[PDB]
Design a protein around this ligand. Structure first.
Ligand SMILES: CCCCCCCCCCCCCCCCCC(=O)OCC(COC(=O)CCCCCCCCCCCCCCCCC)OC(=O)CCCCCCCCCCCCCCCCC
Ligand code: HEA
Ligand code: HEA
Ligand SMILES: CCCCC/C=C\C/C=C\C/C=C\C/C=C\CCCC(=O)O[C@H](COC(=O)CCCCCCCCCCCCCCCCC)COP(=O)(O)OCCN
Ligand SMILES: CCCCC/C=C\C/C=C\C/C=C\C/C=C\CCCC(=O)O[C@H](COC(=O)CCCCCCCCCCCCCCCCC)COP(=O)(O)OCCN
Ligand SMILES: CCCCC/C=C\C/C=C\C/C=C\C/C=C\CCCC(=O)O[C@H](COC(=O)CCCCCCCCCCCCCCCCC)COP(=O)(O)OCCN
Ligand SMILES: CCCCC/C=C/C/C=C\CCCCCCCC(=O)O[C@H](COC(=O)CCCCCCCCCCCCCCC)COP(=O)(O)OCC[N+](C)(C)C
Ligand SMILES: CCCCCC/C=C\CCCCCCCCCC(=O)O[C@H](COC(=O)CCCCCCCCCCCCCCC)COP(=O)(O)OC[C@@H](O)CO
Ligand SMILES: CCCCCC/C=C\CCCCCCCCCC(=O)O[C@H](COC(=O)CCCCCCCCCCCCCCC)COP(=O)(O)OC[C@@H](O)CO
Ligand SMILES: CCCCCCCCCCO[C@@H]1O[C@H](CO)[C@@H](O[C@H]2O[C@H](CO)[C@@H](O)[C@H](O)[C@H]2O)[C@H](O)[C@H]1O
Ligand SMILES: CCCCCCCCCCO[C@@H]1O[C@H](CO)[C@@H](O[C@H]2O[C@H](CO)[C@@H](O)[C@H](O)[C@H]2O)[C@H](O)[C@H]1O
Ligand SMILES: C[C@H](CCC(=O)O)[C@H]1CC[C@H]2[C@@H]3[C@H](O)C[C@@H]4C[C@H](O)CC[C@]4(C)[C@H]3C[C@H](O)[C@]12C
Ligand SMILES: C[C@H](CCC(=O)O)[C@H]1CC[C@H]2[C@@H]3[C@H](O)C[C@@H]4C[C@H](O)CC[C@]4(C)[C@H]3C[C@H](O)[C@]12C
Ligand code: CUA
Ligand SMILES: [O-][O-]
Ligand SMILES: [Cu+2]
Ligand SMILES: [Mg+2]
Ligand code: NA
Ligand SMILES: [Zn+2]
Lengths: 84, 98, 79, 259, 46, 43, 227, 58, 514
């Protein structure tokens, strides 16, 4: 493709700034809008003690060794059902 | 987007980098970045080999596209020739470091 | 009913040396068939072939484990 | 006094302090994973941080102030940087191999499906899409910085360079969030394993590239770079683009197709 | 400026051949020796 | 490859010492460890 | 089994391992041809006073010692690839048997009809009944019908093992979670011996395989008795 | 911010025959010594630890 | 003025020497480790205890020889020494990064040795396959120390490869194209490229195994939908390029030895030799699965991998026959080097041919994890890679030290070694064919003769190795300085004397264009 805009023969930093402010950052703004606009917590997944999940072959080297690094009791259960 | 305030090399390049730049300007290669252009390599018009010392390894590539360079020390004084093809070489010490 | 069965024949669906898939499929096929036929007043002897084929091919520790997991409600397969 | 153009480096202890710091980091991990202490690992991280500060200081001293980086020397540094990036690409390739191995041939213990049973995947049209838009934009902005620099514009180079840095920091925070709010862990099967090792390793390269850009920002503040000589920045922009691209393949592989 | 020429471009001294003999004897000797002591150390745990 | 003559020649005598020292430094440390293999299992 | 001072393969019990014998003879024939030429020609170069140290023409003979080695490889590849497909070929068998490796023994399972299964360990050196072979004897043997196409399935329950019977042309790695297949077919009844052909730790050398091949009659009866 | 590179050039090209890694001032010399100390400290400690790790424990 | 030289070096030569010294030592370790192995199989019964403490020995033997002996001698030693001297460069591109490349190796070795002192240690084989290398069947720092060893050794080689490539491209004279670099320089570059692409994949593979052991990932664990095979693919994808990394600089040194000692000015068919190496380089990347014919992949895949492996014979045959064409019409000076070199050519060819045997997926069923493989690879390494090192050593030892060896003694050495290694490995062919597996510490009764003879072989090899340590002492003892070197017109490395100055080429070579 060639996108759909226009330029290529008035080239330099000017053009690239024009893109930074006229396209790139507005794209980041729209996506930031969309995202902070499907938020609000999703109902947490009913625990099932599947044997192919919450794998413990050796204690983690921290905490009680049953808690992973970015553990969130809101959504991440331990091997024996959710916390409190 | 053309304000100013970024230095140029002319302005702020120093050390050996600078001397290379300043040389390049005049048309001189003190630090051997360009390949030397050959001559006829006869007794009359030998290949002038700049050195600083009294000797310097010449490498001869006797026929363009030979895969084997012929190596030998060129000494100060009289024009020596390549063992393979007998093209002539003369050491021309000094200049370089003024 | 089409028996006189010696062992599981060649199935083109699983033609190579990795027969893992063969055991897994035929085991599912059965317990799906068994489930479905009890819940619509029909015969389980139609499903009996898949039983034989999985029983033949699957290791016993595997079938042991899957049957334990189904009863425990943690069998990852759709049934 | 030499009559060639290459740089004969003054003897330095950093190779030794880095090699030794390697020993400590390796030992220290081994200690931490097994016999439960972190002392070694700390000391290693510190000896390493110090070895890098000093090695790279000297590189700046050798180039910006001593003037050793001739055209010859500098062309050689480009080959080095490119070759480094190639090995990094190959490193990431192992992790994609891993993902593709698992996801195309899902084992019976996953239910014979991808994703595995029990795994609830992130939505790509939400924050992963944001992150994508963030990094791509950071590619546009860094490109503006480079043209500004070549054109000799100090204000604009620094302005776009800041923007870039900011967008990388923004990605890092967004990603650190998603990590926390995610309903699966590195432990949750091969989904979790492939997801977090691969994204984790990328995440790490984002911090390193940001750090590397940040250094260029300060070197730029202190007037080091000229309109034609500024390899440090180039090397950084390459590395940054490399990071941009590794993200693009994560998005298409693990986030989109793998759900 | 560092020392050049035969025997001078190495981290060990070849000034006196018997001093050298022992140097080398401990150097290569240790290397060859080390695996055996490992196998020994491994055996004296159980 | 022409060599100059030995600055400090190593006589057949000396050579014989050299060779012996060299072979013992391998063969004792090993032999010692090797000899005591019954004593390591059944202490 | 291997007999002392053996040079080549165990004699061929299956018609597949026969096939692999003759392909090896074919290959070795070519190996001796080539390694003799290289020795001869080495000896030819070192045993003359005549000299020719000036420049030689590269582009001329390069064609010969590229084209002939290519020919020769086709002579090796064609049968190698024929036998390859022949090994893996459609076979509708009369029996399925599984074996599972463990640290450090094999367990076997015959489950076409019943739930006949058993472990099978090495007979330790100091419990052999004179005539019995050291490191190669199992208490419970793997009994199978001779002259019949048997499906073997090979998995493991711990680490990697590999289930090898050299005399039959069989070897199939035992991988956990993985159900590898191989057809087994003996031309003759007897005892045939194999050993674990992948590293598993401590007692890797001491977990052998022994097949006993007997007529269909005596196999059916061995089943009932083991039930 | 003003352009003090011109200076730093002069300081770092000075003939004092110190190598690049100490040429900045006395700061370097401490920083150097801190670095090295810790590396040697650590290396001894990791050997110490290797010592410990070989022989089992009640 | 010592610590500034040997701990803080920024000099290709001295870094070369450290590499050579490190490898020398490492050898002794591996050599000792090799005898511990043949000792154990030298008579029937047990000596040591069980397969565990044995396969520690086997495992550590392989790592020590591959990573700490061959690779540092060849690429680190002869690499750093000769490359710049051969292309007229004042040094490597990145001399300070170069020195770290070395100093990572002692720390790496330490870690590997610590692997074997703690717990029962690393008794997995050099492959390090899971699930055996897992935390269940191999708990404790045992393996995790090995992993970190390879990480550190992996980074050494990469930083080096970046250097070698950069250097060999960038720092030739202006007028010298790449088709005018000697054949050794070519062999290092290619080798470097294979390192750069291969090692990163290994690093990932062993980093994934590490996470499996310590962070509860399940890459290889069927429990979590993992696959033990995926490791094999990742390990072997590096694994094969590695075996070509170990022999390519050999090829290089052999081309240089054979040319020099038949008194030709160039080896025969330069571009062909260059081409062959690239072809071998390339085809080495698309074959890894020929170490996996018994894991149960698709027939059609095994078909592919059989054919793809065989093709390497062709560019390799070109190289073999070219060396011969170099000897042809030579004034053959029978130096110790030249004996090593001729040895290489025959014995290498032999190891290669047993490689072609094994390349047949059909046949490999029967020969996989049998001593036949152990023969194949000990021919190409122990009488291939190693003969090329020995030949390199005695040829160029004058250039490094400034002192000449005793050729008589050096010929005595060749003879002993030649018989030893042959007597050691040749019988293993039969052991393999008859059905003796790899990684066994005892064997059924019938295997007794061949294992016995073998182990008697390994002893003659020890005598050779011991003897060589003497031969090097003797060189240094007597102090025979070099007068005059032959054929310096076409061998630049020798053109600055023996040894050459700390700083060679301060003023660079003059090369005309035309
Ligand atoms: C050391 C142990 C000695 C054992 C001797 C065998 C006993 C005979 C019982 C006599 C018993 C005879 C009756 C039974 C028939 C055997 C049928 C069989 O089972 O068939 C299979 C057998 C039959 O194989 C053979 O066709 C004989 C094997 C010997 C090969 C010839 C080389 C011998 C050189 C000298 C001795 C070796 C040491 C030097 C090694 C040299 C390094 C290559 O085993 C193999 O397939 C071995 C495959 C090894 C592959 C090596 C690659 C080739 C390198 C040598 C080329 C040299 C040619 C130039 C000409 C020669 C130039 C040197
Ligand atoms: C330097 C080391 C090195 C080298 C150079 C090679 C070279 C080759 N290797 Fe080998 N190999 C190993 C080291 C090496 N290998 C190691 C260490 C293992 C074991 C791994 C483990 O621990 O499990 C191994 C294992 C191995 C296996 C696995 C067997 C198994 O475990 O089941 C196979 C299978 O194909 C193989 C093939 C080859 C081939 C085809 C070549 C080719 O390069 C051969 C090239 C040479 C020739 C072919 C001869 C010269 C050519 C001519 C004279 C021309 C004419 C020739 C013909 C017409 C045929 N190798
Ligand atoms: C370079 C690699 C290399 C080298 C040189 C060797 C050398 C030897 N090897 Fe090794 N070996 C391997 C790599 C190597 N090996 C690998 C990869 C395996 C497979 C591991 C596994 O199964 O996991 C293996 C496996 C292996 C086994 C299999 C054990 C089993 O599975 O049961 C045996 C058994 O005999 C063995 C024996 C020997 C012997 C007797 C030597 C003798 O030849 C040794 C004699 C010594 C030398 C030839 C070196 C002397 C020279 C120097 C030290 C250089 C001197 C220095 C300077 C001049 C600077 N080896
Ligand atoms: C499922 C998919 C199925 C499809 C698959 C099929 C195909 C895959 C796609 C592509 C592969 C095909 C072909 C590639 C082969 C050859 C391309 C050759 C181009 C080239 O190499 O030409 C050179 C580059 O030219 C130049 O500048 C470049 C000049 C550019 C001219 C066009 C620019 C103007 C058009 C508008 C530009 C758009 C602006 C974008 C920004 C907006 C973003 C939103 C020649 O240099 P030159 O002209 O002297 O420069 C003068 C410039 N001052
Ligand atoms: C957000 C982006 C920034 C990420 C970086 C921030 C902090 C971590 C620091 C360093 C990590 C460096 C590299 C990545 C290594 C491993 C992947 C870790 C990915 C990760 O950080 O993901 C976390 C797992 O961390 C865990 O357990 C493990 C905790 C981390 C320590 C693991 C031990 C380190 C392993 C070292 C091996 C390195 C070998 C590389 C070799 C070098 C190249 C040759 C996720 O938490 P979770 O609860 O599972 O799920 C979320 C639940 N809602
Ligand atoms: C699902 C799987 C997912 C995995 C995929 C992941 C990622 C995708 C891959 C890659 C994308 C990543 C990052 C890209 C961003 C930036 C890279 C840097 C770009 C750059 O700036 O490089 C420029 C171009 O590079 C050049 O030519 C190149 C210079 C190369 C020099 C080194 C050469 C050594 C290697 C051999 C080269 C081969 C030569 C060709 C013939 C070989 C025959 C086979 C620099 O030019 P230069 O060298 O000064 O010119 C001088 C040469 N005369
Ligand atoms: C798969 C199995 C392997 C297959 C192996 C088969 C190999 C084929 C071997 C030989 C083929 C016979 C050679 C035929 C080509 C022409 C030979 C020739 O012509 O030989 C020489 C040509 O020199 C020159 O280029 C250079 C010399 C001639 C070229 C030959 C040199 C290489 C020969 C290889 C050495 C043996 C290695 C074999 C490898 C297995 C003759 O030199 P003259 O002094 O007469 O001329 C000089 C000028 N005059 C006319 C004015 C005097
Ligand atoms: C907990 C996790 C933490 C991880 C620790 C790592 C963290 C951060 C690392 C950040 C990288 C900082 C590197 C800064 C480099 C500064 C030196 C520099 O930028 O050097 C430049 C040269 O290039 C050069 O060597 C450039 C040298 C190449 C640098 C690239 C380094 C990549 C580092 C990656 C390391 C991690 C690998 C990942 C392992 C999993 C200097 O020359 P110029 O710029 O042309 O100036 C000259 C003009 O002024 C005169 O006219
Ligand atoms: C799990 C724990 C494991 C830990 C393992 C860690 C291993 C080692 C830790 C120590 C490494 C960090 C220390 C700093 C290294 C930076 C080297 C560097 O940046 O050096 C540059 C060379 O690399 C160039 O160009 C371009 C190439 C830059 C290479 C950057 C090196 C980063 C080190 C990590 C490599 C990761 C590889 C990952 C891929 C698998 C400069 O060359 P020098 O010869 O130095 O100077 C030459 C002068 O002319 C310059 O004026
Ligand atoms: C390849 C590149 C590899 C990159 C380097 C690897 C990085 C590993 C970083 C580990 O960092 C540590 O993690 C611990 C989390 O567990 C933190 O708190 C811990 O520290 C205390 C000290 O023991 C414990 O007791 C506490 O409970 C615990 O929260 C600790 O602050 C932090 O430094
Ligand atoms: C694989 C390489 C090894 C190959 C074999 C090496 C050949 C042996 C050379 C040195 O061996 C010596 O052997 C002696 C045995 O005769 C040992 O003495 C042992 O026995 C003596 C009595 O016979 C006592 O004096 C000592 O206490 C006792 O250690 C002695 O320590 C050991 O050095
Ligand atoms: C064309 C190229 C180099 C020529 C040059 O620019 O110097 C040469 C070098 C090696 C040659 C190859 C090798 O000699 C091997 C092959 C030999 C056959 O004679 C032709 C194909 C063959 C594959 C050759 C084709 C071609 O002539 C090559 C590739
Ligand atoms: C070995 C690898 C998969 C490894 C893995 O499971 O991770 C697979 C991926 C793609 C495969 C290849 C592609 O399918 C293309 C070819 C297909 C032919 O049927 C066999 C050879 C063939 C060249 C394949 C060989 C091999 O099975 C490959 C290379
Ligand atoms: Cu089971 Cu080896
Ligand atoms: O790999 O041989
Ligand atoms: Cu291979
Ligand atoms: Mg195997
Ligand atoms: Na034994
Ligand atoms: Zn000439």
């Amino acid at each position: 493709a060639s996108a759909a805009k226009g330029d290529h023969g008035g080239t330099g930093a000017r053009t690239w700034r024009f893109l930074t402010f006229g396209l790139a950052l507005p794209s980041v703004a729209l996506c930031t809008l969309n995202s902070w606009l499907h938020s609000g917590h999703r109902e947490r997944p009913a625990f099932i003690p599947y044997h192919h999940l919450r794998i413990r072959t050796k204690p983690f080297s921290w905490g009680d060794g049953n808690h992973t690094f970015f553990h969130n009791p809101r959504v991440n259960p331990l091997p024996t059902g959710y916390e409190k | 987007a053309s304000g100013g305030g970024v230095p140029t090399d002319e302005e702020q390049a120093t050390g050996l980098e600078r001397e290379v730049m300043l040389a390049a300007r005049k048309g001189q290669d003190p630090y051997n970045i360009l390949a030397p252009k050959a001559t006829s390599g006869t007794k009359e018009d030998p290949n002038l080999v700049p050195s600083i010392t009294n000797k310097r390894i010449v490498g001869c590539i006797c026929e363009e596209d030979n895969s084997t360079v012929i190596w030998f020390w060129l000494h100060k004084g009289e024009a020596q020739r390549c063992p393979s093809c007998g093209t002539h070489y003369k050491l021309v010490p000094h200049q370089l470091a003024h | 009913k089409i028996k006189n069965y010696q062992t599981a024949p060649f199935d083109s669906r699983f033609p190579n040396q990795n027969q893992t898939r063969n055991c897994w499929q035929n085991y599912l096929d059965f317990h799906r068939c068994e489930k479905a036929m009890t819940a619509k007043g029909g015969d389980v002897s139609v499903c009996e072939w898949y039983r034989r084929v999985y029983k033949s091919l699957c290791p016993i520790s595997w079938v042991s484990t899957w049957d334990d997991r189904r009863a425990e409600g943690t069998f990852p397969g759709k049934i | 006094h030499q009559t060639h153009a290459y740089h004969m480096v003054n003897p330095s202890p950093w190779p030794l302090t880095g090699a030794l710091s390697a020993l400590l980091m390796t030992s220290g991990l081994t200690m931490w994973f097994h016999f439960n202490s972190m002392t070694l690992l700390m000391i290693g991280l510190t000896t390493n941080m110090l070895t890098m500060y000093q090695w790279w200081r000297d590189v700046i001293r050798e180039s910006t102030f001593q003037g050793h980086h001739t055209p010859a020397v500098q062309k050689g540094l480009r080959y080095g940087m490119i070759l480094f990036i190639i090995s990094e690409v190959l490193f990431f390739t192992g992790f994609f191999w891993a993902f593709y191995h698992s996801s195309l041939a899902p084992t019976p213990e996953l239910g014979g499906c991808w994703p595995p049973t029990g795994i609830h995947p992130l939505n790509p049209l939400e924050v992963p899409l944001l992150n994508t838009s963030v990094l791509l934009a950071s590619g546009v902005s860094i490109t503006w910085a480079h043209h500004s620099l070549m054109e000799g514009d100090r204000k604009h180079m620094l302005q776009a360079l800041f923007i870039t840095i900011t967008l990388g920091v923004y990605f890092t925070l967004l990603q650190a969030s998603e990590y926390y709010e995610a309903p699966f862990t590195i432990s949750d099967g091969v989904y979790g394993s492939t997801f977090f090792v691969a994204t984790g390793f990328h995440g790490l390269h984002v911090i390193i590239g940001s750090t590397f850009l940040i250094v260029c920002f300060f070197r730029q503040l202190k007037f080091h770079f000229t309109s034609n000589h500024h390899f440090g920045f180039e090397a950084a922009a390459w590395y940054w683009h490399f990071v941009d691209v590794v993200w693009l393949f994560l998005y298409v592989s693990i986030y989109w197709w793998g759900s | 400026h560092y020392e050049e020429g035969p025997g001078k471009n190495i981290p060990f001294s070849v000034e006196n051949k018997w001093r050298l003999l022992a140097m080398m004897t401990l150097f290569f000797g240790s290397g060859f020796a080390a695996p055996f002591f490992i196998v020994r150390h491994q055996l004296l745990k159980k | 490859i022409t060599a100059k003559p030995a600055k400090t020649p190593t006589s057949p005598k000396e050579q014989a010492i050299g060779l012996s020292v060299t072979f013992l430094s391998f063969l004792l440390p090993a032999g010692w460890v090797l000899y005591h293999l019954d004593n390591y299992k059944k202490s | 089994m291997a007999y002392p001072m053996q040079l080549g393969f165990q004699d061929a019990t299956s018609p597949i391992m026969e096939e692999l014998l003759h392909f090896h003879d074919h290959t070795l024939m070519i190996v001796f041809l080539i390694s003799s030429l290289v020795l001869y020609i080495i000896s030819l170069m070192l045993t003359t006073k005549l000299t020719h140290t000036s420049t030689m023409d590269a582009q001329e003979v390069e064609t010969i010692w590229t084209i002939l080695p290519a020919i020769i490889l086709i002579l090796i590849a064609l049968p190698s690839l024929r036998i390859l497909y022949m090994m893996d070929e459609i076979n509708n068998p009369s029996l399925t048997v599984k074996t599972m490796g463990h640290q450090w023994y094999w367990s076997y399972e015959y489950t076409d009809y019943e739930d006949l299964s058993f472990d099978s360990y090495m007979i330790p050196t100091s419990e052999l009944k004179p005539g019995e072979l050291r490191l190669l004897e199992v208490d419970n043997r793997v009994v199978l019908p001779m002259e019949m196409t048997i499906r073997m399935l090979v998995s493991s329950e711990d680490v990697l093992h590999s289930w090898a019977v050299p005399s039959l042309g069989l070897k199939t790695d035992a991988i956990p979670g993985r159900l590898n297949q191989t057809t087994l077919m003996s031309s003759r009844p007897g005892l045939y011996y194999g050993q674990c052909s992948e590293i598993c730790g401590s007692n890797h050398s001491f977990m052998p395989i022994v097949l006993e091949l007997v007529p269909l009659k005596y196999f059916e009866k061995w089943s009932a008795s083991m039930l | 911010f003003e352009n003090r590179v011109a200076e730093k050039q002069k300081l770092f090209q000075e003939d004092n025959g110190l190598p690049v890694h100490l040429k900045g001032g006395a700061t370097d010399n401490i920083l150097y010594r801190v670095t090295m100390t810790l590396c040697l400290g650590g290396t001894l400690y990791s050997l110490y630890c290797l010592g410990w790790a070989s022989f089992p424990h009640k | 003025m010592f610590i500034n030289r040997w701990l803080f070096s920024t000099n290709h030569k001295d870094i070369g020497t450290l590499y050579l010294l490190f490898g020398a030592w490492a050898g002794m370790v591996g050599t000792a480790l090799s005898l511990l192995i043949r000792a154990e199989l030298g008579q029937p019964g047990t000596l040591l205890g069980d397969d565990q403490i044995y396969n520690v020995v086997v495992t550590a033997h392989a790592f020590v020889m591959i990573f700490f002996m061959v690779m540092p001698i060849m690429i680190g030693g002869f690499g750093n020494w000769l490359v710049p001297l051969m292309i007229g460069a004042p040094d490597m591109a990145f001399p300070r990064m170069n020195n770290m490349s070395f100093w990572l190796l002692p720390p790496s070795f330490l870690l590997l040795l610590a692997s074997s002192m703690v717990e029962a240690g690393a008794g997995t084989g050099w492959t390090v396959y899971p699930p055996l290398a897992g935390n269940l069947a191999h708990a404790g720092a045992s393996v995790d120390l090995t992993i970190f060893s390879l990480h550190l050794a992996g980074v050494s080689s990469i930083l080096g490869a970046i250097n070698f490539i950069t250097t060999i491209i960038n720092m030739k004279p202006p007028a010298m194209s790449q088709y005018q670099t000697p054949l050794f320089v070519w062999s290092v570059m290619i080798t470097a490229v294979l390192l750069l692409l291969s090692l990163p994949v290994l690093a990932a593979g062993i980093t994934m195994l590490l996470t499996d052991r310590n962070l509860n990932t399940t890459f290889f664990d069927p429990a979590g939908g993992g696959d033990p095979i995926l490791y094999q693919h990742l390990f072997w994808f590096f694994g094969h390029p590695e075996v070509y990394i170990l022999i390519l600089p050999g090829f290089g040194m052999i081309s240089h030895i054979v040319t020099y000692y038949s008194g030709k000015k160039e080896p025969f068919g330069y571009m062909g030799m260059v081409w062959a190496m690239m072809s071998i380089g390339f085809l080495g990347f698309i074959v890894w699965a020929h170490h996996m014919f018994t894991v149960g992949m698709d027939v059609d895949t095994r078909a592919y991998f059989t054919s793809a492996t065989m093709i390497i014979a062709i560019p390799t045959g070109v190289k073999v026959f070219s060396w011969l064409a170099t000897l042809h019409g030579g004034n053959i000076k029978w130096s110790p080097a030249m004996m090593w070199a001729l040895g290489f050519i025959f014995l290498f060819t032999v190891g290669g041919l047993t490689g072609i045997v094994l390349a047949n997926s059909s046949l490999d069923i029967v020969l996989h994890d049998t001593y036949y493989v152990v023969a194949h690879f000990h021919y190409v390494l122990s009488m291939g890679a190693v003969f090329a090192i020995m030949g390199g050593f005695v040829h160029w030892f004058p250039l490094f030290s400034g002192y000449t060896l005793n050729d008589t003694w050096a010929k005595i050495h060749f003879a002993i070694m030649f018989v030893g290694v042959n007597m050691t490995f040749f019988p293993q062919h039969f052991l393999g064919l008859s059905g003796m597996p790899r990684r066994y510490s005892d064997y059924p009764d019938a295997y007794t003769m061949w294992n016995t003879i073998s182990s008697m072989g390994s002893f003659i090899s020890l005598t050779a190795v011991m003897l060589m340590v003497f031969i090097i002492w003797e060189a240094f003892a007597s102090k025979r300085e070099v007068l005059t070197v032959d054929l310096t017109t076409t061998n630049l490395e020798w053109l600055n004397g023996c040894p050459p100055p700390y700083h060679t080429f301060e003023e660079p070579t003059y090369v005309n264009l035309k």
